[PDB]
């Protein structure tokens, strides 16, 4: 008498019908693609090819596989975008276990770090591997980063210190590696520093974008922690905030507002934070119906951020609309700061990435192996 | 804590 509620599902399919029927009015772009396997991870590479006098540009994504066999890959996919275009797998690299998360290094986007079900973080240089995977089934990472006892998801490259990499784990710790001086030839590298302030699964970690010594972490202990690598005490952060009424799954620093960040939580809210006074939450974004797992600021607009999670929705928020007036009927669809609800996915969303070269384009991937590349209608973000 | 599948 327990699977009957899981058989709705019927509600999902009905809402999907309605959504597809309305995409002409809500979107300027909708591309849907069933991947061979679900990807737990998605990140646009920063580069973009705009071929000679053609009406499209070529973009690329770091993706992964999630299969229960022994043929998992780190994937690089290409995406033709116009200036309701195809999607091609360019490279597959043998990967040990499913790819929990894959992130390119800002100072050299050929370098990809991945999180694996074994506690290791693997580093690949995808230019050093063939386009077709090794039929031996063997995984040959360019670096093997040691230090965790359990898998995790949080992964962050320092954008101001080349090769300084943070990782968050279910073992309650945060590992910092510095691979800057290490030749990427398959060596094992031990963690330079291990931060132990959290008392529960650490869900996410993220470097500040301007201050090279500052980073933040969020964990199942409901805390946001702000760390400073200049501190000698690796068991106690600079700041600790009781951030949510449940697990905190993600955080993201505003790339235009150096004091501002956001966290997403199993309490179904996105919280807004000001580093200058972390005692006081600036705002709580409240319309997700289930646990939030990913939050990301717009790369192009300082007031714009997006959140996704297990309610299969991707919410786009506009903090400049906080406090706005709305007609009582318009006030039913949600708060004024809720700019858009993406309802294209029919399963839990695992990751999404704002395209850094085409404003308002987003790639989101879900558990049913669907990948969507989409852009809300221009009239929605111009009112 | 995330659960896969």
By C-alpha distance, which of A90, A37, A41 is closest to A66?
A37
Nearest-angstrom CA–CA distance, A140 and A137: 10
- Coil vs helix vs strand at A152: coil
For residue A346, count CB atoms less than 10 angstroms from its CB and return exposed for 0-12, middle for 13-18, buried for 19 or more: middle
Using omega within 30 degrees of 0 as the cis cutoff, is the peptide bond preceding A57 cis? no
- Coil vs helix vs strand at A175: strand
Pick from A66, A201, A203: CB nearest B4: A66
Shortest Cα distance, chain B CAs vs residue A184, angstroms? 30
Shortest Cα distance, chain A CAs vs residue B1, angstroms? 7
Residues of A in contact with B1 (CB under 8 A): 170, 201, 203, 220, 247
- For B1, the closest chain A residue by CA position comes to A201
Extract the tokens encoding A190: 């031990």
Beta carbons within 10 angstroms of residue A222's beta carbon: 18
Q: Do A98 and B4 touch (CB under 8 A)?
A: yes
Pick from B1, B4, B5: CB nearest A220: B1
Q: Do B2 and A203 touch (CB under 8 A)?
A: yes
> What is the DSSP pairing of strand A361-366 with strand A292-297?
unpaired
Residues of A in contact with B4 (CB under 8 A): 40, 66, 98
Q: Do B2 and A153 touch (CB under 8 A)?
A: yes
Residues of B within an 8 Å Cβ radius of A? 1-2, 4-5
For A336: left if phi > 0, alpha if psi spans -120 to 50, otherwise beta; the answer is alpha
Beta carbons within 10 angstroms of residue A212's beta carbon: 15
For residue A203, count CB atoms less than 10 angstroms from its CB and return exposed for 0-12, middle for 13-18, buried for 19 or more: buried
Nearest-angstrom CA–CA distance, A294 and A270: 10
DSSP state letter for A326: -
Extract the tokens encoding A157: 């490259």
By C-alpha distance, which of A383, A381, A367 is closest to A28?
A381
Confirm if A354 and A361 have CB atoms less than 8 A apart.
yes
Nearest-angstrom CA–CA distance, A271 and A346: 26
In chain B, the largest separation of any two C-alpha atoms, in whole Å, equals 13
For A305, phi and psi rounded to 5 degrees?
A: -145, 165
Residue A7: which residues within 8 A CB-CB, separation 6 or more? none
Resolution as reported, in Å = 2.1
CATH code reported for the domain at A1-383? 2.130.10.10
Residues of A in contact with B2 (CB under 8 A): 153, 203, 249, 293
- For B5, the closest chain A residue by CA position comes to A367
Extract the tokens encoding A221: 């202990």
Nearest-angstrom CA–CA distance, A355 and A197: 34
Sheet of A223-228, strands arranged across? A202-207, A214-219, A223-228, A239-242
H-helix segments, chain A: 3-6, 10-26
Residue A376 C-alpha from the chain's centroid: 19
Nearest-angstrom CA–CA distance, A105 and A144: 16
Half-sphere exposure (CA, 13 Å, Cβ side) for A121? Answer: 33
Interface membership of A203 toward B (CB under 8 Å): yes
Shortest Cα distance, chain A CAs vs residue B2, angstroms? 8
Q: Do B2 and A98 touch (CB under 8 A)?
A: no
Name beta bridge partners: A206.
Answer: A216
Domain spans, chain A: 1-383
- Coil vs helix vs strand at A320: helix
> What is the DSSP pairing of strand A260-265 with strand A248-253?
antiparallel
Q: From the CA atom positions of chain A, what is the Rg in Å?
A: 20
Nearest-angstrom CA–CA distance, A114 and A109: 13
Name beta bridge partners: A306.
Answer: A296, A316
């Amino acid at each position: 008498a327990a699977f009957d509620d899981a058989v709705e599902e019927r509600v999902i399919n009905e809402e999907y019908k309605i959504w597809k029927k309305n995409t002409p009015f809500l979107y300027d772009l909708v591309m849907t693609h069933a991947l061979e396997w679900p990807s737990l991870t998605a990140q646009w590479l920063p580069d973009v090819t705009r071929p000679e006098g053609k009406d499209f540009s070529i973009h690329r994504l770091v993706l992964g596989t999630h299969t229960s066999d022994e043929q998992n890959h780190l994937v690089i996919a290409s995406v033709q975008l116009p200036n309701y275009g195809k999607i091609e797998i360019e490279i597959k690299i043998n990967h040990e276990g499913e790819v929990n998360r894959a992130r390119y290094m800002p100072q050299n986007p050929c370098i990809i770090a991945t999180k694996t079900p074994s506690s290791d973080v693997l580093v690949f240089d995808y230019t050093k591997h063939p386009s077709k995977p090794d039929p031996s089934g063997e995984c040959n990472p360019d670096l093997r980063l040691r230090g965790h006892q359990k898998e995790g998801y949080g992964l962050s490259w320092n954008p101001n210190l080349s090769g300084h990499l943070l990782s968050a784990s279910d073992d309650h710790t945060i590992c910092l590696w510095d691979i800057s001086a290490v030749p990427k030839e398959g060596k094992v590298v031990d963690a330079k520093t291990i931060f132990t302030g959290h008392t529960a699964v650490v869900e996410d970690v993220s470097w500040h974008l301007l201050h090279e010594s500052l980073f933040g972490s969020v964990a199942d202990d409901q805390k946001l922690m702000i760390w400073d690598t200049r501190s000698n005490n690796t068991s106690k952060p600079s700041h600790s905030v009781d951030a949510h009424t449940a697990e905190v799954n993600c955080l993201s620093f505003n790339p235009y507002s150096e004091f501002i960040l956001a966290t997403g939580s199993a309490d179904k809210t996105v919280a807004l934070w000001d580093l200058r006074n972390l005692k006081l939450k600036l705002h709580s974004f409240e319309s997700h119906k289930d646990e939030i797992f990913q939050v990301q600021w717009s790369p192009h607009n300082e007031t714009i951020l997006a959140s996704s999670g297990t309610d299969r929705r991707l919410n786009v928020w506009d903090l400049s609309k906080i406090g706005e007036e709305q007609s009582p009927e318009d006030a039913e669809d949600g708060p004024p700061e809720l700019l858009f609800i993406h309802g294209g996915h029919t399963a839990k969303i695992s990751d999404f990435s704002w395209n850094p070269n085409e404003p308002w384009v987003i790639c989101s991937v879900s558990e049913d192996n669907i990948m969507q590349v989409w852009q809300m209608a221009e009239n929605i973000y111009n009112d | 804590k995330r659960r896969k599948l």
